[PDB]
Structure 1
């Protein structure tokens, strides 16, 4: 996601933490964000451009084979030079395992728990963005130029940001905090309140990232790439039909992030 999807995913997650998770998250954050995880959940998108964090660039996404519409960890979760685990599913495992040493303490200089928290929180968002688990040759739709209503865009960006920005504008006066409340509403009492226990039961961490990534490639095929031709204009049709899919993935990432953090920081 771009900034808004991450902010919403992290705020949903922060509001669902248990007491030990809430406290750990508070101890790990810098004072300037006043306890707000969502104010830093974009940080991995900032530092992926830094020379010292070049290793992080492949960790935001998964390249799956063109037109195959499936994910397999061994085949797909590796960077462009074949180094294993270097994808968003591998990263979620890595930082979850790192945070599980926080309770007992670590005598390793190099494990930074603030960064583990921010990477984990961000990547839990990314694995839920369907076009972050799209085809290899089009870079998850980044190479598919198009137009979104009047202005120029690309298919990846439509899912990272445009659908969210158009929904916020048309129904919430550009107000993301209120959009987020309706998402929160839709799983506390609304249409997703039925599915909640389901979202939370995905096995161990490998099992959950496999599940999340599979859901994402399947949405990328069924809803993302579906109907789209390069150079053309997408508008009310694509926007109205895809919006609810985008909203659910925001919600799902948040809910599942909270579950992970509750497990790693809890008993």
Structure 2
């Protein structure tokens, strides 16, 4: 996701922390964050080149199909197993279990927070052949955009402006209300993990969404506008809510 998606996920998550996780997060964040996890939930994107080994950790490349399997797909372009967003979530969650080494656990917190978000963006678990939709060039209303960017940013930005009247917290607040009043039974399933982290579950949902919602109906050169926007917005909402709920549930397990 772009900035807005990560902020939403991290705002939802931080308000769902239990006392032990809330305490650990306050302790691990730098002073400059002013206690707010969401102020640093794009940090991982800002070290893609300084930590160039981290760049493949934001996504999963799959074959042209609707399936994900860790052993088949969780690898970087050189074939190194584990080097994908699912593998990164396992790595950094494991590191945080040691909290109160060799590792910087502030970085581990910021990585797991960002990557729990990215594994929920459908086009972060999608086809190698189109670079997760980056090579699918369309228009978003009147402007050129690639499909990946539409999912990272344009849908959310257009909703924030047109539907939420530029209210920086309107979408968050509406998602939180629905977590309580519309989605309670589902939320319980979203939180449950028979392990500490369950990223493969989330990735498998994501490639299915990439097939059925993101790529579906889209051809190079199309104009995506209201029909696509209104029909895909509920799945964006779902994935943001899932990401926030699962980030909190995972941190609660780690720090508990």
Per-residue CA deviation, residues 182-225 of structure 1 (Å, 9 max, x unaligned), is 01111112x2123111111232146x211100000000000000
- TM-score, normalising length from structure 2? 0.98
1:36 paired residue number: 36
Paired residue secondary structure (2:83): coil
Unaligned residue ranges in structure 2 (runs of 5+): none
Question: For 1:76 and 1:13, how far apart are their aligned partners in 2?
Answer: 28
Q: What stretches of structure 1 move > 6 A for 4+ residues in a row?
A: none
1:238 aligns with 2:235: no
Deviations 1:155-200 (A, max 9, x none): 10111011101111111122231111101111112x2123111111
Contact 1:202 1:211 in 2 (8 A): no
Aligned with residue 84 of structure 2, among 63, 68, 87: 87
* Cα distance, 1:264 vs structure 2: 0.5
Which one of 200, 212, 218 corresponds to residue 228 of structure 1? 218
Aligned to 1:55: 53
Q: Measure, in 1, the Cα distance between the counterparts of 2:131 and 2:14.
A: 31
Matched, 1:26 2:26: yes
Match of 1:56, SS state, is helix
The answer (yes or no) to whether the contact 1:64–1:134 under 8 Å persists in 2 is yes
CA distance in 2, matches of 1:179, 1:259: 21
2:122 to 99, 124, 130: 130
Taking the TM superposition and a 5 Å limit, the aligned residue runs for 1:43-122 are 43-50=43-50, 53-66=51-64, 68-103=65-100, 106=101, 108=102, 111-122=103-114
**TM-score of the aligned structures, taking structure 1 as reference length:** 0.94
Give the Cα–Cα distance (whole angstroms) in 1 for the partners of residues 6 and 81 of structure 2: 26
Number of positions where the alignment pairs a residue of Structure 1 with one of Structure 2 = 256
Number of the residue aligned with 1:14: 14
> Residue 4 of structure 1 corresponds to which residue in structure 2?
4
1:198 paired to 2:152: no
SS at match of 1:141: coil
Q: In 1, are the aligned partners of 2:10 and 2:244 still within 8 Å (CA)?
A: yes
RMSD: 0.9
Q: Secondary structure at the match of 1:195?
A: helix
Deviation at 1:117, TM superposition (A): 0.1
In the alignment, is the contact (CA less than 8 A) between 2:196 and 2:254 conserved in 1? no
Secondary structure of 1:176's counterpart equals coil
Q: Distance in 2 between matches of 1:205 and 1:119?
A: 16
Deviations 1:19-39 (A, max 9, x none): 110011001111111100000
Q: Indicate the SS of the match to 1:153.
A: strand
Q: Which runs of 5+ in 1 are unaligned?
A: none
